[PDB]
Design a protein around this nucleic acid. Structure first.
Lengths: 142, 122, 62, 207
RNA sequence: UAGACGGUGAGAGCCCGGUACGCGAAAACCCGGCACCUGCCUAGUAUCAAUUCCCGAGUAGCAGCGGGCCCGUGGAAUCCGCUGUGAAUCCGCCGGGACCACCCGGUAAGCCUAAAUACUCCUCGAUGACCGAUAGCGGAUUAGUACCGUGAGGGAAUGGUGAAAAGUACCCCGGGAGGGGAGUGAAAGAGUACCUGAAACCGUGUGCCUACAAUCCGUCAGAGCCUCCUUUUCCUCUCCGGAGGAGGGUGGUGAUGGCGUGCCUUUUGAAGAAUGAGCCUGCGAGUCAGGGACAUGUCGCAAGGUUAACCCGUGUGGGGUAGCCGCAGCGAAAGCGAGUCUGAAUAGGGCGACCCACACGCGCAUACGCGCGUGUGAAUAGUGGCGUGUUCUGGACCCGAA
RNA sequence: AUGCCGUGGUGUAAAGCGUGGCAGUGAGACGGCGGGGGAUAAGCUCCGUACGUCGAAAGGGAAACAGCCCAGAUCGCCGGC
RNA sequence: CGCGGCACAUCCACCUUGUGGUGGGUGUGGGUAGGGGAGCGUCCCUCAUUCAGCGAAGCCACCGGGUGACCGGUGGUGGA
């Protein structure tokens, strides 16, 4: 019951109250100084006055393409163990098994020996994926 | 949750004051002045018990020297002789003997004198 | 209410697929007549963050 | 695992086997602890208000100038250390609830009930009425004749004819619908009483 | 169908006001319903040739100066405003991020539009791991009062008798207040200045030391008295008591010796002639929100995990798959994939994959292991919540400027 | 001469390295030994030592004494060397 | 050095032999800023239990206890 109900050993760490005497933590308590740190927190960015690393280092080159359609990546080894009987592989089926993000286009990698002779109804297969699928005896789609 | 922090503090106040009783003026009346004195008093007790032990050695030595001089012998040669005799007797009870039974002290002096070799050469 | 990422850090540092951060070196945008190809090759490329400020940088990015 | 109680104003009827959810669970007191404290956290209204500087009326004046007065550098008349001043780091009126995983909630609940089944504290009764109207007296005789304990949890369902009216006014007796079966009431109450519909609804919702 | 709270001489289901629950509105108001009254229509729907007109004007658009939208005039679209100029009505005009051809979409410069959303002077009913008179609104009491200020404005303190006033009849000192004796009263050790009644502070009675002696006003040795007290010489009075005393042991006091330079802060450094505190009581200074971030410990699950807003319901439980982190990363990007990039190629290099006490099939090897598969059962992990420490924006440990 | 780097043994309790978490310090003084600045100067100031002490260390000694000599207090002891 | 009582690491032999502990040995234990670990205490909600007008809280004095923060008992005041 509740009177036998206990917290887990090692959890429920007591709050270290700070400004409660010298035996508990101290009068200055961490801020054992008289400078800025004693009275206020200096921004983590500020180095001292010299140019911080944020301006000292050069700007990361390049840009970012707005029209970049990122594809989700499906492990053919995961196909091998997930559907050892083959038969048919749908995207709805793969997400039903939780192997890939929902509502997204996919790609197939070839890292893993494929033995399951199964056609895959999906998108954008790699050349090595075609090598493994045709090795098993299946067919690529898009 | 206001807690009214009086009670917890009062435990300290009444404890320190009841221990501090007997001190003169603003020592046995004021908490914050008494507190100072307990710190000084107890640091003093801390070193004074040890100094006390040394002090008692000084007293015992003086008395042994007095009785020894009454038997025409110095403390130096007295202890040297007793060590040569193996008489592992402390200065507390030796000084006691000096009062309870001076004759026993004289006997120990004769033992030391006989045990001492001959002179100051080696 | 919600953390902010330092925009310069997001525009200068690039996190990799693991717990590593790299810094672009480019002390080569002003004068390039006196610098040898040795020096420009030392600057060319991308260099892991030295371990002497990662405890700061990771908080600057996050 | 497979036991049934008697029937009020009758003999015996029912005989319903309990599933694994109410027996085969190694209940963890740390889990039940965390969930129960979440419930007690939710029970709080969070009305613990106070008043900080800025809400205290006035105080913008800075009396007792810093030269020729011999007084401390006041700077405001409503600073904490002054009588009637503001509260620093006070109990601001927090509004919170320790959101937990549903799997932790369900696991803790079925753990507690499964322990009650292990100790024989489940009394899955059939009903409690003199036909349609309530009778608290008869409720007392029934519950105190079969259970004989102080704190009792009663699960009936959405039936107000003789549901939460006959069991009311019985110190230690609390009542709820199956859908609201929390754990705090389960750990407080010993002889947990269920209706047939309580078991069917609970089991059906919980597979 | 009443065990909610409160009151009553103390802790009340059954004493009381009430609660559960059921009744209950002349009249007024609000809402809803019914009738009257008010008000709209003698059709432009459909097929068609396309000669003609129309679809909101000093408007749009353009130029200049400005605003604001992540957008700081910048390559600067959309929107709004000002100033000059100044078009068209379907083969039209504007927009789709300078801009232009094509394509999709909608037809501006005219009006109105409840719900979902926000707020509480005020009035209901309820709640509270909110306060209990230096707290809570500043204001529990003649409170935005007394009072300060030319004024705008600023802005206090004072709670508690006792169940019932039963507020001490009467007498005696005293001018009276006040007090004592009586008396009510459970109690006056609850008397209007009053529940409990600490400390500072004041004072009295009394045990002990002190007027030839210096020292943070103590500590440790430490005699003699005082008080409490055991054994005991002893009083033989003994069915009593233990008187006074030796010795022993508590609680005080303390002769006299030894030793010893207040506390805090800040300081290279302090007993301080560096600062601060007259004393006592009370008040008061590192805390919280966030599906924040980083790290760590425990607890759920297990290539998954997890739900926010929101719906139902009665306690805060059941649902809710939009989304997030992980799962494959590299590259400026296209892109391709265990490779990828620079690069003619990479022989090399940046980044990430793959660890055996080992068998079976197999090349090499004296022995020791390189490699493709199954295990001789070989190597492994994230996510969420509650805690801890730190950190970010939030008044940010508190108080304090000119 | 010392000292520094590395190497093969002996010896040693934790001292070291790497990766993380959280802070302090970022005003030093004196003495001894080498110097420079100064006047052959200073209780002056500026340097080095894996030289020490104080700072952050009470105690004993130097009459008194943060920095000199000896020595690093867990507590108690009417015990010693 | 000796003789006793606490504690921290490591080690020896054990009980649930890295969760957690028992007997013993050696070494260690001055310490501010600062890190870490383990605790006392006032108030409040809940659960189990319970003393309680034959006298609680609070307060006062005394005697005791704990390595410490502190705790208990007795007696008095007071009266929930």
């Amino acid at each position: 019951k509740l009177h036998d109900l206990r917290p887990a050993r090692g959890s429920k760490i007591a709050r270290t109250r700070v400004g409660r005497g010298d035996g508990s933590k101290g009068k200055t308590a961490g801020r054992g100084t008289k400078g800025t740190r004693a009275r206020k927190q200096v921004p983590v960015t500020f180095e001292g006055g010299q140019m911080p690393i944020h301006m000292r280092l050069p700007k990361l080159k390049g840009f970012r393409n707005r029209f970049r359609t990122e594809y989700e990546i499906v492990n053919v080894g995961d196909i091998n163990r997930l559907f050892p009987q083959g038969g048919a592989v749908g995207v709805d089926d793969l997400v039903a098994k939780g192997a890939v993000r929902k509502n997204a286009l996919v790609k197939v990698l070839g890292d893993g020996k494929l033995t399951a002779k199964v056609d895959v109804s999906a998108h954008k297969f790699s050349g090595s994926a075609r090598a493994k699928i045709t090795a098993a005896g299946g067919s690529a789609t898009e | 949750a206001r807690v009214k922090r009086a009670v917890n503090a009062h435990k300290k106040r009444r404890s320190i004051l009841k221990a501090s009783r007997g001190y003169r003026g603003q020592r046995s009346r004021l908490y914050r002045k008494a507190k100072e004195q307990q710190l000084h008093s107890l640091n003093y007790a801390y070193r004074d018990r040890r100094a006390r032990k040394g002090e008692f050695r000084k007293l015992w030595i003086a008395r042994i020297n007095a009785a020894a001089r009454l038997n025409d012998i110095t403390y130096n040669r007295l202890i040297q002789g007793l060590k040569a005799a193996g008489v592992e007797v402390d200065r507390k009870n030796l000084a006691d003997i000096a009062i309870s039974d001076p004759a026993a002290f004289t006997a120990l002096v004769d033992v030391a004198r006989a045990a001492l070799p001959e002179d100051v050469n080696a | 209410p919600k953390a902010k990422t330092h925009s310069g850090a997001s525009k200068r540092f690039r996190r990799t697929g693991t717990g590593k951060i790299v810094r672009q070196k480019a002390n080569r945008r002003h004068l390039l007549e006196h610098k040898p190809s040795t020096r420009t090759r030392r600057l060319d490329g991308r260099t892991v963050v030295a371990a002497n400020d990662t405890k700061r940088v990771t908080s600057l990015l996050n | 695992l497979k036991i049934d109680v008697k029937t009020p104003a009758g003999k015996v009827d029912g005989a319903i086997e309990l599933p694994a959810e109410l027996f085969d669970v190694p209940a963890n007191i740390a889990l039940m602890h965390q969930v129960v404290t979440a419930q007690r956290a939710a029970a709080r209204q969070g009305t613990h208000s106070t008043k900080t500087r800025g809400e205290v009326s006035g105080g913008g004046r800075k009396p007792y100038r810093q030269k020729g007065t011999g007084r401390a550098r006041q700077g405001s008349t409503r600073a904490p250390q002054f009588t009637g001043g503001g509260v620093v780091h006070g109990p601001k009126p927090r509004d919170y609830s320790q959101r937990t995983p549903k799997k932790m909630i369900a696991a803790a609940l079925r753990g507690a009930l499964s322990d009650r089944a292990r100790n024989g504290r489940i009394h899955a009764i059939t009903e409690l009425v003199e036909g349609q109207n309530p009778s608290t007296k008869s409720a007392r005789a029934f519950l105190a004749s079969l259970t004989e304990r102080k704190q009792v949890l009663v699960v009936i369902g959405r039936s107000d004819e003789a549901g939460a009216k006959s069991v009311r006014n019985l110190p230690g007796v609390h009542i709820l619908a199956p859908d609201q079966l929390n754990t705090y009431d389960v750990l407080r109450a010993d002889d947990v009483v269920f209706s047939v519909e309580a078991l069917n609804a609970y089991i059906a919702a919980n597979t």
